[PDB]
Design a protein around this ligand. Structure first.
Ligand SMILES: *[C@@H]1O[C@H](CO)[C@@H](O)[C@H](O)[C@H]1NC(C)=O
Ligand SMILES: *[C@@H]1O[C@H](CO)[C@@H](O)[C@H](O)[C@H]1NC(C)=O
Ligand SMILES: *[C@@H]1O[C@H](CO)[C@@H](O)[C@H](O)[C@H]1NC(C)=O
Lengths: 75, 109, 495, 75, 49, 99, 50, 75
């Protein structure tokens, strides 16, 4: 829908407060946290897969973060 | 919530007379939105003081305003016959409204 | 005094040979200009107006369907046809349903079916556009006269406002008593209104990117359309439901107003009811102070007694404003005002309301001055009855340096490559810095457009780690700088 | 927005068709495609970052895919 | 200032993606799901035998 | 049969009776009588204050904005106990009848 | 800080950290106490009544 | 409780006596001593744990003192 393309990285930004800037700043992270709490099973699998794939600990953490961030949103 | 002023006041000509406007922490004890209005009989109020002490361009310099805590005071130094009128105190309150004093009648005699 | 009491104040000090200075003006901000022989002025962008908007697209946020019709065809007979498929005010869909003897068909297969309904818009959001030549920036220039407009409106002074348009980008203010000031503005560079739409939706208007506006998934009209009836993406506002294979149906998708509000996050809200007013953005102007003169510099010291009628207060910027009344002789006199030390051996602070003078005896004048950090004494008047005021400024010089570096960086974050013009007096270092910022910002905006602040922070962390774990020092330092700048911009991006 | 928390993975699906299955089956992939087209610059830099971080092409490709899928999402 | 932030009917319609529609207009009827039954053929006798 | 309402969501509201209260810097929070009522949505924030707007100080004054929240459309969500779950089945033999 | 005919000169941040129900400095009604839960306790001993 | 956060260590002290300085100077020491007396069992465990986390008598004595001081405080 329109809500899925929320006019964020378009430049055009100034000192004046934008629309819904207090909430949209953290609502995405709040949503991801709620999803991870409501679906513990997938997060464990994501950690296991990232550990398997990531050679170093940097790669593993990056892959795990990307997986857990894209799992709910890709929905 | 009306600002409290003495019902009446009298002062001999050429003297100095003071008027009090006691309010709450919101109207006259919290903000400098204190204004004094002089109303001659049958006429609209005339802004005598504003911002506690500042007086309008045409307003004489004999009129001085002071504020202490929840009380704002108006003083007249010349006490001319033309000064005998009814004086109202107003303040812009914290809730966005205007409150007026009960008005004091100043008499020279 | 207009520019005092605003937390986004900027102090621009110094004009170059030619008596001009480059100042960027922002809407929420204010600029106080201090020059040596010139008076102190306050500049505020108080209004941007776009006139004669032209609609380029009218989106539908709420529709309805009225005249549903269905055509059905037996298997192997091809897809059916409805006469209303040719109709552009109808939304249609082709599906397949199970067919057989029970359906009066006789072949037992998947018979194509078509269902159509009339799409009618009940609510739309305009997408007006404005030509860059139709903008008009209103600016108020107020000098630090230390006086007030006075309530007696028979004479109204101290209120010079200048309108700046792309056609007339050079204008002079005639500040009474101070000569005249010339502003050489460049409205054509403040905002690219050829890539912006004035999005108006139910008595609320936003300023949005034009490609974003044209990418919205809602049905739209061309803009010149005066009867609807040719909505383009009608399928985005309807759903065709074929549960199992019995029937096909079509229903609308409810008001999209709230989904639009969610989509508009990060778009600056404007006003479009009584004209198109944009209280957002900046203006780059050149200040011509050559014909700008201090008022009353031929006057003499007062040599009288002053009384403080407004007690000394500290503004949000480290300066102090006081209001004194003169009670003496020689009404048009310079006010003796010094910020000394306790013994009065050294001059510690510089006043901001430069050349404070008394024009009328019964006329208070309020002085703004910048004291030093720590103990300082404000001296007003001369030996007989001279009033000595004490003051303590709580900050630190290192703290002020840190705050100014932070303010400059924040200005760069908002006015990227235009922050080099905010106080620029020409010069070669400023030009080189601005050119480097332009070249770097081109790449940065290309590589970071359409990315949320969380993604910016993630990418900054990744780049910083990559630079840290780099064998080459030349690459490591550059990567670490890029990562830290990315982290900063992500931490201070949403506005 | 509620629109960011759809009812997709709730595990109640039957043989009956769902609310917007036809429409919403490819909406996210379409959004990712459109975003990647409109913002090529982030695509190149994401590819560079994935190539650097990923020691093996599997890790690099996975990282690039996840970055590209998550960038429009938070956006 | 405070604004009421629009109407969320369409946002909910988008949120309900992946949820099967039902009929609660009159009766709360459901036309989705299954039902496992055990069939008893004991008393079934062919007609026309 | 006989579903029980578990929760009513608001999908379309309206705000009315908006009011605001301000206080000078360092003097605390402003007070609004409507803050007591839960039909009013309220928020505290800071504005620039100074001589210009009637304060003796030049800091960030606290401000509270309160508006009345009224709901116009609902998204009621009901629940059913598995006991009131009438299923309907149709058994048709292969009788061979014409229709 | 003054409390029942005795006054103290306290730290401002400490005073604003006090875990008691409070009213704003300018509150006329006197009834909209903020953190009332610091001065009441709720009892559900056996999960029978509260 | 408000009594659990006294106006102590605030840097506002003068020559004049504070509210309950004389009385409250040694209240904490008295309380810790009484707790140690009433609960000798925990003190022995704390000493054993401090000795186990040792390698230095300064470390052991400091850890034991901290544990004994925090046992009543945590309450
Ligand atoms: C649509 O239906 C209405 C009845 O509500 C009818 O009056 C109108 O003529 C119809 N229009 C069509 C079928 O194009
Ligand atoms: C189905 O049955 C009804 C009544 O038994 C009959 O009228 C009809 O012709 C049959 N065939 C259909 C509806 O295709
Ligand atoms: C809100 O305002 C309306 C007038 O529009 C009035 O009738 C009503 O009593 C007000 N409610 C409150 C709680 O003040």
């Amino acid at each position: 829908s329109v809500a899925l393309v929320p006019h964020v990285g378009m430049g055009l930004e100034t000192r004046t407060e934008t629309w819904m800037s207090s909430e949209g700043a953290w609502k995405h992270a709040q949503r991801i946290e709620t999803w991870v709490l409501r679906h513990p099973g997938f997060t464990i699998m994501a950690a296991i897969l990232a550990y398997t794939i990531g050679t170093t600990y940097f790669q593993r953490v990056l892959i795990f973060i990307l997986l857990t961030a894209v799992a709910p949103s890709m929905t | 919530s009306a600002l409290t002023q003495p019902a009446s006041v009298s002062g001999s000509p050429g003297q100095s007379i003071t008027i009090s406007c006691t309010g709450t922490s919101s109207d006259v004890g919290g903000f400098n939105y204190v204004s004094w209005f002089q109303q001659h009989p049958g006429k609209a109020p005339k802004l005598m003081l504003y911002d506690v002490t500042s007086r309008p361009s045409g307003v004489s310099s004999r009129f001085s305003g002071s504020k202490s805590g929840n009380t704002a005071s108006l003083t007249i130094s010349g006490l001319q016959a033309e000064d005998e009128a009814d004086y109202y105190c107003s303040s812009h309150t914290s809730r966005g409204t205007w409150v007026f004093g009960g008005g004091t009648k100043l008499t020279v005699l | 005094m207009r520019c005092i009491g605003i937390s986004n104040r900027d102090f621009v000090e110094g004009v170059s040979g030619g008596s001009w200075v480059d100042i960027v003006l922002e809407h929420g901000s204010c600029v106080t200009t201090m020059a040596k022989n010139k008076p102190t002025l306050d500049f505020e962008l108080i209004k941007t107006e776009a006139k004669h908007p032209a609609t380029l697209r009218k989106y539908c946020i709420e529709a309805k369907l009225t005249n549903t019709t269905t055509a059905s065809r037996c298997p192997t007979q091809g897809e059916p046809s409805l006469n209303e498929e040719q109709d552009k005010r109808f939304v249609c869909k082709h599906s397949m349903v199970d067919r057989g003897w029970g359906n009066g068909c006789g072949l037992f297969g998947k018979g194509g079916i078509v269902t159509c309904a009339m799409f009618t818009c009940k609510k739309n959001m305009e997408g007006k556009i404005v030509q860059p030549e139709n903008l008009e920036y209103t600016i108020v220039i107020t000098p630090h006269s230390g006086e007030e407009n006075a309530v007696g409106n028979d004479t109204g002074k101290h209120g010079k406002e200048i309108k700046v348009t792309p056609q007339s980008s050079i204008t002079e203010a005639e500040l009474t008593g101070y000569g005249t000031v010339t502003m050489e503005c460049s409205p054509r560079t403040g905002l690219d209104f050829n890539e912006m739409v004035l999005l108006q939706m139910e008595n609320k208007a936003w300023l949005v990117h034009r490609q974003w506006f044209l990418d919205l998934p809602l049905p739209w009209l061309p803009g010149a359309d005066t009867q609807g009836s040719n909505w383009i993406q009608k399928e985005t506002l309807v759903t065709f439901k074929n549960p199992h294979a019995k029937k096909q149906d079509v229903v609308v998708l409810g008001s999209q107003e709230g989904a639009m509000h969610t989509a508009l996050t990060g778009a600056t809200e404007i006003q479009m009811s009584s004209g198109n007013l944009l209280f957002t953005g900046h203006l780059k102007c050149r200040l011509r102070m050559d014909k700008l003169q201090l008022k009353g510099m031929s006057y003499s010291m007062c040599t009288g007694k002053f009384k403080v009628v407004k007690e000394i207060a500290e503004t949000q910027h480290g300066t102090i404003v006081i209001r004194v009344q003169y009670e003496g002789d020689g009404s048009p006199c310079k006010i003796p005002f010094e910020i000394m030390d306790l013994e009065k051996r050294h001059v510690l602070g510089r006043l901001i309301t430069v050349n404070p003078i008394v024009t009328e005896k019964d006329s208070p004048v309020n002085i703004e001055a910048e004291p030093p950090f720590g103990d300082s004494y404000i001296i007003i008047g001369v030996e007989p009855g001279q009033l000595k005021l004490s003051w303590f400024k709580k900050g630190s010089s290192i703290g002020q340096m840190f705050e100014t570096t932070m303010r400059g960086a924040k200005r760069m974050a908002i006015l990227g490559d235009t922050a080099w013009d905010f106080g620029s007096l020409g010069g070669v270092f400023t030009s080189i810095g601005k050119a480097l910022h332009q070249v770097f910002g081109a790449i940065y905006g290309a590589a970071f457009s359409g990315v949320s602040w969380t993604m910016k922070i993630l990418i900054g962390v990744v780049i910083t780690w990559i630079g840290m774990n780099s064998r080459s020092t030349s690459l490591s330092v550059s990567l670490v700088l890029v990562g830290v700048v990315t982290l900063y911009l992500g931490v201070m991006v949403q506005a």
